[PDB]
Amino acid sequence: MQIFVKTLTGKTITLEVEPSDTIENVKAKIQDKEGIPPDQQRLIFAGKQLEDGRTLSDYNIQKESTLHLVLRLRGG
Amino acid sequence: MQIFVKTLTGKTITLEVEPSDTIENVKAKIQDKEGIPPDQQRLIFAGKQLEDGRTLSDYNIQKESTLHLVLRLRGG
């Protein structure tokens, strides 16, 4: 299925995912597309930051959802 | 069957396709005609971006439909 990922610079990319994909694997797919390692990504859906070990399914993320990517350095 | 592909420059090309063709194969047919590799193509029908692994059939695209080609560099 298809989901969207939009950034703070307004940009939107699309991903080919399955609900069974982990959030970490979704970041790998962003990395495959954009070159940014997963640990520099934060993914947000409905205002909650998604945990790497859970799935799109666990968050009831259906096709044509938009996740929000926020880049953040390893830490804070 | 015959479908149309129109671009942002107004141009329209025609393709000889079957409903069972994948969207990726449709981009290969554009590539055979225009020289543009599939991963530089985005195909849109009724405002939704088509996924490479699905078929014209999956989208209920009938003969004499017009798809919309948008060129986009590998990424965003």
UniProtKB/Swiss-Prot annotation, chains A, B:
Record-listed ADP-ribosylglycine modification sites: G76
Membrane-related topology note: Peripheral membrane protein
Effect of H68G: Loss of DTX3L-mediated polyubiquitination of histone H3 and H4
Cellular localization per UniProt: Cytoplasm; Nucleus; Mitochondrion outer membrane
Effect of R72K: No effect on ADP-ribosylation
Outcome of substituting G76A: Loss of ADP-ribosylation
UniProt-annotated site: Interacts with activating enzyme, residues: R54, R72
Record note on modification: Phosphorylated at Ser-65 by PINK1 during mitophagy. Phosphorylated ubiquitin specifically binds and activates parkin (PRKN), triggering mitophagy. Phosphorylation does not affect E1-mediated E2 charging of ubiquitin but affects discharging of E2 enzymes to form polyubiquitin chains. It also affects deubiquitination by deubiquitinase enzymes such as USP30. Mono-ADP-ribosylated at the C-terminus by PARP9, a component of the PPAR9-DTX3L complex. ADP-ribosylation requires processing by E1 and E2 enzymes and prevents ubiquitin conjugation to substrates such as histones.
Cross-link (Glycyl lysine isopeptide (Gly-Lys) (interchain with K-? in acceptor proteins)): G76
Positions carrying (Microbial infection) ADP-ribosylthreonine: T66
Site positions per UniProt: Essential for function: H68
Domain Ubiquitin-like: 1-76
Effect seen on changing R74K: No effect on ADP-ribosylation
Phosphoserine PTM positions: S65
Outcome of swapping R72G: No effect on ADP-ribosylation
Crosslinked residue numbers (Glycyl lysine isopeptide (Lys-Gly) (interchain with G-Cter in ubiquitin)): K6, K11, K27, K29, K33, K48, K63
Function (record text): Exists either covalently attached to another protein, or free (unanchored). When covalently bound, it is conjugated to target proteins via an isopeptide bond either as a monomer (monoubiquitin), a polymer linked via different Lys residues of the ubiquitin (polyubiquitin chains) or a linear polymer linked via the initiator Met of the ubiquitin (linear polyubiquitin chains).
Protein name (Swiss-Prot/TrEMBL): Ubiquitin
Source lineage: Eukaryota, Metazoa, Chordata, Craniata, Vertebrata
Gene name in the database record: UBB
